[PDB]
Structures are given as structure tokens and as C-alpha cells.
Design a protein around this ligand. Structure first.
Ligand SMILES: Nc1ncnc2c1ncn2[C@@H]1O[C@H](CSCC[C@H](N)C(=O)O)[C@@H](O)[C@H]1O
Length: 280
């Protein structure tokens, strides 16, 4: 088959679609509509969906994987949307998860949990003990967080703040455990401000600004650069080096929203200081 895109077989059964852009989609078909097991991949070989369809709407328990390694899994609603009471955002280690109430893939109330096993397609989670509820809480131009002192579950296991070993750098960010290359370790969340705002005020104030996109800049200003005032995320604590063990990369966070992460470039040691090359 060929439309300027591409499709594979006669009536129905199990076929593959490919878009004007390289990305595949493996579906099982029934009368030309999708019904059954599907898996879609990225223009780059990356699994971005696994799960199933019924009358061309996503059905059942489906996995959506972001490029950063994080994922969303749950039984979808009648419209195929990630809305329900038993949905989870799962972190890049594929084990820590925030389970619970989500609207449209957005988190209303997520409880710390662990994904013990995918038995079939379905996954089994188990709640972790503790009072901790997490909520979608994107920061604004003036509110860095609705709960500045609730740490991020994933971060508090892989990293910590302490005196820098670098010459005169105040504090730094340390790895807590040994990790191999390409590992997310910490989140860089702050108030969202505009490039012009950052370009026009005294520059002596952009020590913690980090550009998100062509329109937005994340900053960790005011007194939130002190951990007794803010510790939700710890990214703004990594110091600079010309030969870093880490890189800034994009991240889709369930509490923070579109932000950056600190990801490792090589294996790193427990207790090793984490660095990135500032300014890209
Ligand atoms: N290689 C380096 N040498 C000296 N200061 C550094 C540095 N990398 C980062 N810094 C200080 O770290 C800043 C980035 S924010 C990283 C955290 C910071 N040192 C703190 O104590 O909160 C810059 O303002 C620079 O002053």
C-alpha cells in the first residue's frame, strides 16, 4: 500500500503503517479498523506506545514512553485518554512510580509506588509506605512550587546536596549511587520567565537561569537557591566544568511539567561530584 505514507496487507489481520516521516506503528486489524495489540515506534527506533486498540481507539492497559525514559501506564478511558483512578507515571529507572488519579495524562494525585512486574501487558504496583502525594504543579513566572520542601522521590535516591569539592563554588551536587552512562539523576525546575526578562534585568541575577525553549527560561532565584527554602528539585546545584560527567537534557515531569534534567555522560561513582558544561 502507498498514499505518500504506506500500509501492509489486504483486508485486515496484523499489519504495519509508516508515516511521511519514518515512524512505524504495528497494529492488529479487524475489518480495517485497529482491534488488538499495537506498538508504535519513533522515527528513530524508539518504542513510544505499546498496548492495544478496539474500533480504532486505544483500549485497555497501555504504555506511552517519553523520549527521556519516563512513561505513563494505565487502563485508558472510553476515549483512549490517560484518565482514570489507576494510572501511573513511571520514572526512567522503570521502577519508581507515582500511581493514582490522572486527567488526560496529567496527574491529579499520585502516590509513591513501585512497579514490581509486568505479568503479561498489565503491570503490578505496590504502594510505598509514607504520606506522600504528588500533584501536577507546573511553576509560574512567580511561584516555583506549591510544596517547595517536598523532595522528588527519584532524585532523593540518586543524588544529594553538599559542599562543592570544586574550588570556589559554594555547594555542589553529588551522586549517591554508582550509575552507568545516560542516566537521569536530577531535575532542573524553577520559575518560568521569559528570555527578554532575563536579557533585560541586571545579569548578575542569571547565575541559575537555564533556557528551556525559544520562549521560556527556568530560573532558581529569590532565596530558593537555599535548600532549606526549596528542595523539590536539585538540578540548579550541579556546578560547571569544561570536562563534565554530565549533560542538561529535556525532561517531561509529572509534577513539574516540561523542564530539564541532569543526565550522566559516563559511569559515575557513588559520591562523585556531578558537573555539566554551563551555557551549552
Ligand atoms: N566550575 C565552577 N567554579 C566556580 N563557581 C562555579 C562553578 N560552577 C558553578 N559555580 C557557581 O555555581 C553557579 C551555578 S548554580 C550551582 C550551584 C551553586 N555553586 C550553589 O552553591 O548553589 C554559578 O553562579 C557559579 O558561581
Amino acid at each position: 500500500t502507498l498514499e505518500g505514507y504506506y500500509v501492509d496487507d489486504a483486508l485486515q489481520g496484523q499489519g504495519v503503517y509508516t508515516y511521511e516521516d519514518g515512524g512505524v506503528l504495528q497494529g492488529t486489524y479487524v475489518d480495517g479498523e485497529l482491534n488488538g495489540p499495537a506498538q508504535e515506534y519513533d522515527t528513530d527506533g524508539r518504542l513510544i506506545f505499546k498496548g492495544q486498540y478496539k474500533d480504532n481507539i486505544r483500549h485497555g492497559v497501555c504504555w506511552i514512553y517519553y523520549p527521556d525514559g519516563g512513561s505513563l501506564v494505565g487502563e485508558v478511558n472510553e476515549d483512549g485518554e490517560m484518565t482514570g483512578e489507576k494510572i501511573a507515571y513511571v520514572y526512567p529507572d522503570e521502577r519508581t512510580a507515582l500511581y493514582g488519579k490522572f486527567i488526560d495524562g496529567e496527574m491529579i494525585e499520585g502516590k509513591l509506588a513501585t512497579l514490581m512486574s509486568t505479568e503479561e501487558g498489565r503491570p503490578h504496583f505496590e504502594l510505598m509506605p509514607g504520606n506522600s502525594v504528588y500533584h501536577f504543579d507546573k511553576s509560574t513566572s512567580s511561584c516555583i512550587s506549591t510544596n517547595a520542601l517536598l523532595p522528588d522521590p527519584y532524585e532523593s535516591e540518586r543524588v544529594y546536596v553538599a559542599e562543592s569539592l570544586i574550588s570556589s563554588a559554594g555547594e555542589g551536587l553529588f551522586s549517591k549511587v554508582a550509575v552507568g552512562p545516560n542516566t537521569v539523576m536530577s531535575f532542573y525546575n524553577g520559575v518560568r520567565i521569559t528570555h527578554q526578562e532575563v536579557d533585560s534585568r541586571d545579569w548578575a541575577l542569571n547565575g541559575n537561569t537555564l533556557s528551556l525553549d525559544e520562549e521560556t527560561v527556568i530560573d532558581v532565584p529569590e532565596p530558593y537557591n537555599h535548600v532549606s527554602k526549596y528542595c523539590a528539585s536539585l538540578g540548579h546545584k550541579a556546578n560547571h566544568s569544561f570536562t563534565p560527567n554530565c549533560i542538561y537534557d529535556m525532561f517531561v515531569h509529572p509534577r513539574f511539567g516540561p523542564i530539564k534534567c541532569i543526565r550522566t555522560l559516563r559511569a559515575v561513582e557513588a559520591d562523585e561530584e556531578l558537573t555539566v558544561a554551563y551555557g551549552y
